[PDB]
């Protein structure tokens, strides 16, 4: 139920504390005071706060603390055992008074109750909250440990225990301190795992943890990454029971769990041919593909802001330029999930609750945020925000936060990471054009100015955060010919499923491209022309004709009649 | 997705023998939350039954318990007053690490 830390220090079971000299002095300073004598350590999970509480006790034996503190002894509250050790009621109260009686008899002694937040908020829990401040009266000292989230809820509302207590801020230890601190626990793992850790191996762990596992604090995460590495040598090598492991395995575990340096052949061709692979699928956008791929390459190389996402792009252009198509195809080539979002639905200020979750306790609170949950499930993703201009300006505030720090908190308070997400947005600010050309015998290219609309709709600070604003030009006549070929291939795949093979002459393709080529409309009419001329006759034959069983179709054009001729053989 | 197949499947791989030697001999189990609640009418029955199973795991030192739907034990049987949930009883043992238990739950 209780342990004597002084005896434990003599035995040597507790690990010697390393560093945290500044934190210890501040704690002892408030502890010595007649009032505000109950120090409280506020720290996130695994930062080191609990170690500091036990480290102070070990220091007493060393004698580096003031001579008056030598009288003090630390006791740990076994909250778990106390709760179980009860039959009807009152068990906690009787035993706690006897312990506190020793503390009251010897005012020097301290009572370190771990996880003080648990005490405040079944039957024994009600009594335990009141027992602390009333019986102590502010004279008997008590140490506590509660996180920032728990400290606000548990201590701010009551304010009686908070006034008696005095917080002591905590910060993440330095990289140098981390290697020193992990050395204390390193001998334990090597013995059980029967592995040997090189000095370079532990050096890699701290750097890898912050870059890939920044969500979880570096000090505790450092302990966890080296633990998995030891297990790897025990189980991963089936033969030779290989000890004497180095950084290579360390990268193998930290990178794998986080899910990398030393680019492999597969990864190399994924980014090397990313631009050429996207040019085949989408034509006439070489300037746009190169810019998008270059930014992604910068992130892999690492020449970019750490907290910001890999890349932020805004595709503004006329209809049918395949702005969204390049986004969908990018996901396919990269093998990264495409989180496609439509901002037309999010055109109201109230709809923001769907993005970051509803307020706590609401009927729809269980659903949660649609953006935070999705990104958490798929950390590496392509966040396509189509028609951003349509959405209410409130979402832009949220997007500004992601661009600046790549983080977003929902009502629950979960922290998301957008460092690996290639944010991409699309807008139609300049689709509107001057249909009226020059009023003269000959036409003139009086097209509306480019990028002028984007500036008015979007604020300047928002534009600055974006890595680049890629304008998509109107497809050329030559480009339309290439577009017809891909659509023809898609038609062939559909026909192949039904057992029909289609052969289209090169002359026929040129005729269809010319008939359906409209610069303003874009490439979408080409599908419509193909559907009207090719899909419609084939569908009638496929249902009520020879093609039902399956056949070979050859399409040609008659020069005299300037119309396509369809030949069905079956 | 296959999380349940991964846990139950581990048992199949162990009997086949295509697993590491360390995990070659592990008596995997499948805790049933509903089964425990069946005979918890009398006070203290849940603690007695739950403590008995936990004791078996630690003494063996190799038994592993696969408890699917770990969210259920968060609010397990607590008639009144004691509020001795399954999570509370198992919380200290997991911290020590003597007993290892696999879990499977949905993102929500």
């Amino acid at each position: 139920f209780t342990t004597n830390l002084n005896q434990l220090a003599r035995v040597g079971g507790i690990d010697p504390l390393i560093g945290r000299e500044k934190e210890l002095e501040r704690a002892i300073q408030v502890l010595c005071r007649r009032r505000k004598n109950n120090p409280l350590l506020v720290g996130e999970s695994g930062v080191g706060k609990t170690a500091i509480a036990e480290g102070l006790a070990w220091r007493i034996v060393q004698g580096d603390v003031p001579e008056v503190m030598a009288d003090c002894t630390i006791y740990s509250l076994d909250i778990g055992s106390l709760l179980a050790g009860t039959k009807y009621r009152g068990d906690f109260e009787k035993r706690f008074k006897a312990l506190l009686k020793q503390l009251e008899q010897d005012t020097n002694s301290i009572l370190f109750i771990d996880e003080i937040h648990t005490i405040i908020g079944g039957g024994q829990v009600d009594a335990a909250n009141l027992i602390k401040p009333l019986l102590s009266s502010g004279k008997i000292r008590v140490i506590g440990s509660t996180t920032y989230q728990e400290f606000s809820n548990i201590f701010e509302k009551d304010r009686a225990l908070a006034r008696r207590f005095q917080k002591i801020d905590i910060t993440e230890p330095s990289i140098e301190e981390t290697v020193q601190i992990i050395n204390g626990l390193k001998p334990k793992y090597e013995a059980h795992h029967d592995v040997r850790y090189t000095a370079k191996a532990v050096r890699a762990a701290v750097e890898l943890a912050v870059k890939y596992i920044n969500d979880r604090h570096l000090p505790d995460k450092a302990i966890d990454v080296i633990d998995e590495a030891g297990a790897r040598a025990r189980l991963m090598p089936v033969s030779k029971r290989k000890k004497t492991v180095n950084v290579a395995d360390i990268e193998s575990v930290v990178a794998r769990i986080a899910r990398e340096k030393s680019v492999s052949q597969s990864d190399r061709d994924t980014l090397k041919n990313l631009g050429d692979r996207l040019k085949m699928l989408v034509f006439g956008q070489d300037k746009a593909i190169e810019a998008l791929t270059e930014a992604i390459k910068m992130a892999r190389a690492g020449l970019g802001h750490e907290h910001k996402p890999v890349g932020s792009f805004l595709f503004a252009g006329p209809t049918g330029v395949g702005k969204t198509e390049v986004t969908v195809q990018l996901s396919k080539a990269l093998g990264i999930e495409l989180l496609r979002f439509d901002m037309s639905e999010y055109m109201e200020r109230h709809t923001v609750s769907r993005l970051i979750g509803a307020p706590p306790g609401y009927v729809g609170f269980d659903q949660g945020g649609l953006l935070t949950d999705a990104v958490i499930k798929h950390p590496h993703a392509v966040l396509l925000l189509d028609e951003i201009e349509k959405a209410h300006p409130d979402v832009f505030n949220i997007l500004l936060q992601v661009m600046d720090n790549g983080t977003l908190t929902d009502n629950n308070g979960r922290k998301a990471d957008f460092r690996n997400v290639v944010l991409v947005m699309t807008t139609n600010a300049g689709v509107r054009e001057t249909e009226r050309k020059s009023i003269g015998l000959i036409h003139q290219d009086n097209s509306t100015d480019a990028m002028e609309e984007i500036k008015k709709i979007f604020t300047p600070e928002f534009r600055n955060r974006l890595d680049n604003i890629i304008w998509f030009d109107h497809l050329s006549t030559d480009v339309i010919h290439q577009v017809v070929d891909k659509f023809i291939v898609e038609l062939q795949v559909q026909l192949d499923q039904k057992g029909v093979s289609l052969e289209v002459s090169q002359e026929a393709r040129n005729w269809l491209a010319e008939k359906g080529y409209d610069r303003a409309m874009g490439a979408r009419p080409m599908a419509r022309v193909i559907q009207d001329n090719l899909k419609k006759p084939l569908a009638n034959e496929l249902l009520f004709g020879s093609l039902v069983d399956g056949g070979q179709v050859t399409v040609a054009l008659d020069k005299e009649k300037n119309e396509l001729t369809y030949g069905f053989q079956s | 997705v296959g999380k349940t197949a991964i846990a139950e499947g581990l048992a199949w791989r162990i009997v086949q023998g295509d697993v590491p030697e360390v995990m070659a001999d592990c008596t995997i189990y499948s805790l049933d939350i509903g089964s425990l609640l069946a005979g918890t009418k009398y006070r203290g029955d849940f603690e007695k039954r739950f403590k008995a199973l936990l004791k078996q795991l630690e003494q063996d030192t190799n038994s592993i318990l696969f408890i699917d739907e770990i969210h259920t034990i968060i609010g397990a049987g607590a008639a009144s007053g004691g509020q001795v949930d399954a999570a509370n009883l198992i919380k200290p043992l997991l911290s020590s690490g003597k007993i290892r238990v696999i879990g499977s739950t949905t993102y929500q």
Partner: peptide
Amino acid sequence: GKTNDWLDFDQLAEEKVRDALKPPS
């Protein structure tokens, strides 16, 4: 004229609690 502003009506979830008995012996 002037723009028309609409106001939403927040709805908070409310629930009740049942009880389970246990004979001492």
